[PDB]
Design a protein around this ligand. Structure first.
Ligand SMILES: *[C@@H]1O[C@H](CO)[C@@H](O)[C@H](O)[C@H]1NC(C)=O
Ligand SMILES: *[C@@H]1O[C@H](CO)[C@@H](O)[C@H](O)[C@H]1NC(C)=O
Ligand SMILES: *[C@@H]1O[C@H](CO)[C@@H](O)[C@H](O)[C@H]1NC(C)=O
Ligand SMILES: *[C@@H]1O[C@H](CO)[C@@H](O)[C@H](O)[C@H]1NC(C)=O
Ligand SMILES: *[C@@H]1O[C@H](CO)[C@@H](O)[C@H](O)[C@H]1NC(C)=O
Lengths: 341, 391
């Protein structure tokens, strides 16, 4: 149980979008920052103190290397970041002729305050190109949370009132071929010099989002810290039914050098490493079955935030049916004694 | 001796049922292929099996009633195999005249023929082979269908190509004669039926626990088969199996049944209390479903026990109605069991298909385990009831 609060900043020399999310509880605070200057980006800040604020300076951000920090420097711990640096056009017309990627740096993202509404705790990012995405573009859907619960959307996750949601989609696209395969290039940034470890977990319960039993994870440290999580599925149409599975695939983490991906100014402001970038491609779908040809839009869901990653909990229904199933052998032992008398 | 120690009748009995268990899988063996003949979509092609399952319960009940009342045990087989051959030849005629409702009408006869022949075979084997070596004839009856179905599936496909290469390339109407060359199996059933009738002519010179046994049969045979019918999709998601090697798991509860059931049939009658065997088989089935559903252990182990617990429940449960209801009434009880089992399977296939996408996969296993638990409860209740009277 923690509070929520949104806030936006604009600069007179050059207005741009900036959404800052603050969650405060008893003795812990979170400092999600969502910037879309050139690329979309996320930076996490954890403070053991219950009071902490930001210090913005648009003058430095106007080769910027300014400081965007918090006053309690001693409370700084586990600062991490993600950068959705590129969108990859994967073709593989036979089973794959890598059409040149679209750079997520020349998009004129719309005003946040137009779509922001604290009642539902959501915001929209939509950039469009300057030269594809003629009608509509990527639509990022950031969302905070207040209490533990389960969303009603067809991709059902388990938020712990301490994480965020990043339903990402793009509406309206003209493919460069008669095939559907899209990809994103997630580039993490570990606080310490190491390689983040990605694993794969197995779950018994399948009441939620049927036909999948795997719950991916990505931990920046073997300790209480931040974590990624997403069910390996992707939906293409609003009535997200079991038909449109469209499986997604991960990759292996590399250690790429600088200048291989565009640099987000927000990350350079929060950090000073800019050399330990680790990126992995993230494809959607396969030519095996249903793809992205009938519709014009692809949706994905994932979490982000610090805390203990939820696993699953069995629902009362299956537990009760198991209980009544176990009643059958026990019932006769009562009945057997009845005939015994 | 009486009839050469039952050897010739045992040999003839197993070969009687090629009329129904051979030509049943023609559309399954001819999946697609005939789709491009004139025009066929997937939805329509399932009507070739709906007529074999839905208009069956009342018709098989009527057939059993006729066997009990009018026809008698002797002439039941000869007329029902005649219905089988009539259905097969009219199916061939519908193939040769290119009409589809002629094709569809064949199933309206072949279904009654097959089910009535099965019930007549069961009651006849019970009537004659009683006393010694009783559970074994059910073993061969079960094994024959599995040893014939795959052979037909391969042989019809091979003969299609053989006839296409030899006779020539007609206007793709050769499937009619292809069915006709497959129709030759049904005549053998007629010959066996007349031979059996001749031998029988020369040879001459309800209650409470029955309902419980019906419940056992319905519960087990409705909680086992649709799980296998589901098959492919579940094992491609719960476990990581290749698209090709996954067919070994789904199709091993059948291929291990026929080479094993005669052994259990031979073993059970020799010093065997049937109730104990049935209880052990049902407990094994429950353990197998629990292991498969609630743990990630190797599916080979969990699916191996199902083969034994399905090959042992057969040829060890049906003979129960041989002792409970006396003679002069088997032809109705067996038909009632067949009707209720067929209706249960037909009504639960749709329910499972409807619940699969609506709730997932864990709930399906939960429901199956509940059904098998009810089966075990009724089994042990039958054990409790038999304690008082006995015999
Ligand atoms: C968003 O709207 C506010 C309304 O006053 C304006 O001040 C700001 O410059 C706008 N920013 C963008 C990027 O449109
Ligand atoms: C913030 O910007 C102002 C204006 O350029 C500058 O004078 C000040 O030093 C900056 N604060 C820093 C760099 O901490
Ligand atoms: C928060 O963590 C910093 C780490 O350097 C420590 O110095 C400080 O005492 C901590 N404060 C509380 C209230 O735990
Ligand atoms: C395949 O793509 C070409 C253009 O690249 C297009 O003209 C054609 O209609 C496409 N084929 C189909 C079946 O859509
Ligand atoms: C992703 O795919 C692109 C395709 O051009 C390739 O160059 C790159 O090495 C792949 N991996 C990463 C981490 O970007």
């Amino acid at each position: 149980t923690r509070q929520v609060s949104m806030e936006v900043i604009s600069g007179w020399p050059n207005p741009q979008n900036l959404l800052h999310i603050r969650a405060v509880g008893s003795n812990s605070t979170l400092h999600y920052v969502w910037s879309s200057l050139g690329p979309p980006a996320v930076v996490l800040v954890a403070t053991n103190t219950t009071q902490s604020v930001l210090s913005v300076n648009w003058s430095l951000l106007l080769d910027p290397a300014g400081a965007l920090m918090v006053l309690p420097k001693s409370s700084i711990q586990f600062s991490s970041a993600l950068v959705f640096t590129r969108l990859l056009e994967f073709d593989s017309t036979n089973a794959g002729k890598p059409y040149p990627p679209y750079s997520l740096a020349k998009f004129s993202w719309n005003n946040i305050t137009n779509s922001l509404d604290l009642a539902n705790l959501s915001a929209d990012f939509q950039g469009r190109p300057v030269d594809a995405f003629a009608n509509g573009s990527l639509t990022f859907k950031v969302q905070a949370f207040s209490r533990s619960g389960r969303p009603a959307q067809p991709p059902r996750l388990l938020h712990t009132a301490d994480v965020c949601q990043l339903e990402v989609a793009l509406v309206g696209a003209s493919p460069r071929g008669n095939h559907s395969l899209f990809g994103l290039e997630v580039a993490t940034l570990g606080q310490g010099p190491d390689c983040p470890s990605v694993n794969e977990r197995n779950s018994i319960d399948d009441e939620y989002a049927p036909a999948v039993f795997q719950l991916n994870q990505l931990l920046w440290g073997s300790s209480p810290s931040g974590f990624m999580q997403w069910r390996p599925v992707a939906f293409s149409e609003e009535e997200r039914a079991r038909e449109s599975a469209l499986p997604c695939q991960a990759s292996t983490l590399h250690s790429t050098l600088a200048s291989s991906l565009p640099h987000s100014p927000i990350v350079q402001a929060f950090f000073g490493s800019q050399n330990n970038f680790c990126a992995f491609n993230l494809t959607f779908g396969a030519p095996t079955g249903p793809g992205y040809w009938d519709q014009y839009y692809l949706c994905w869901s994932m979490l982000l935030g610090m805390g203990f990653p939820p696993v699953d909990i069995f629902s009362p229904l299956v537990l009760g049916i198991m209980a009544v199933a176990l009643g059958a052998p026990g019932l006769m032992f009562l009945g057997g004694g009845l005939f015994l008398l | 001796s009486r009839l050469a120690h039952r050897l010739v009748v045992l040999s003839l009995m197993c070969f009687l049922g090629f009329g129904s268990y051979f030509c049943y899988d023609n559309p399954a063996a001819l999946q697609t292929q005939v789709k491009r003949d004139m025009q066929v979509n997937t939805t329509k092609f399932m009507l070739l099996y709906a007529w074999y399952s839905w208009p069956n319960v009342v018709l098989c009940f009527l057939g059993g009633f006729l066997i009990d009342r009018i026809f008698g045990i002797r002439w039941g087989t000869v007329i029902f195999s005649c219905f089988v051959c009539i259905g097969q030849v009219i199916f061939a005629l519908g193939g040769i005249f290119n009409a589809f409702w002629l094709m569809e009408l064949g199933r309206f006869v072949f279904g009654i023929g097959g089910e009535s022949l099965a019930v007549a075979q069961n009651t006849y084997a019970v009537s004659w082979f009683k006393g010694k070596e009783l559970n074994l004839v059910f073993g061969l009856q079960l094994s024959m269908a599995r040893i014939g179905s795959t052979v037909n599936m391969n042989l019809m496909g091979w003969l299609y190509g053989k006839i296409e290469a030899l006779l020539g390339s007609a206007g793709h109407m050769t499937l009619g004669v292809t069915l006709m060359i497959g129709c030759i199996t049904c005549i053998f059933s007629l010959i066996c039926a007349l031979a059996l009738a001749y031998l029988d002519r020369r040879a001459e010179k309800f209650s409470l626990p029955l309902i419980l046994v019906f419940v056992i049969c319905v519960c087990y045979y409705v909680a086992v088969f649709p799980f296998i019918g589901l098959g492919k999709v579940f094992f491609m998601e719960k476990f990581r199996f290749s698209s090709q090697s996954a067919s070994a798991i789904n199709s091993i509860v059948y291929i291990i049944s026929a080479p094993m059931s005669p052994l259990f049939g031979l073993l059970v009658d020799k010093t065997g209390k049937n109730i104990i065997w049935v209880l052990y088989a049902v407990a094994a089935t429950l353990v197998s479903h629990m292991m498969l559903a609630f743990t990630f252990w190797n599916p080979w182990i969990a699916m191996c026990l199902l083969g034994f617990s399905y090959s042992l429940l057969a040829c060890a449960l049906w003979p129960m109605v041989a002792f409970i209801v006396p003679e002069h009434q088997l032809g109705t009880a067996y038909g009632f069991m067949q009707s209720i089992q067929n209706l249960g399977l037909a009504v639960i296939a749709i329910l499972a298909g409807m619940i699969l996408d609506s709730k997932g996969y864990l709930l399906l296993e939960v429901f199956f385990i509940a059904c098998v638990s009810l089966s075990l409860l009724a089994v042990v209740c039958l054990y409790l009831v038999n304690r008082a009277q006995g015999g």
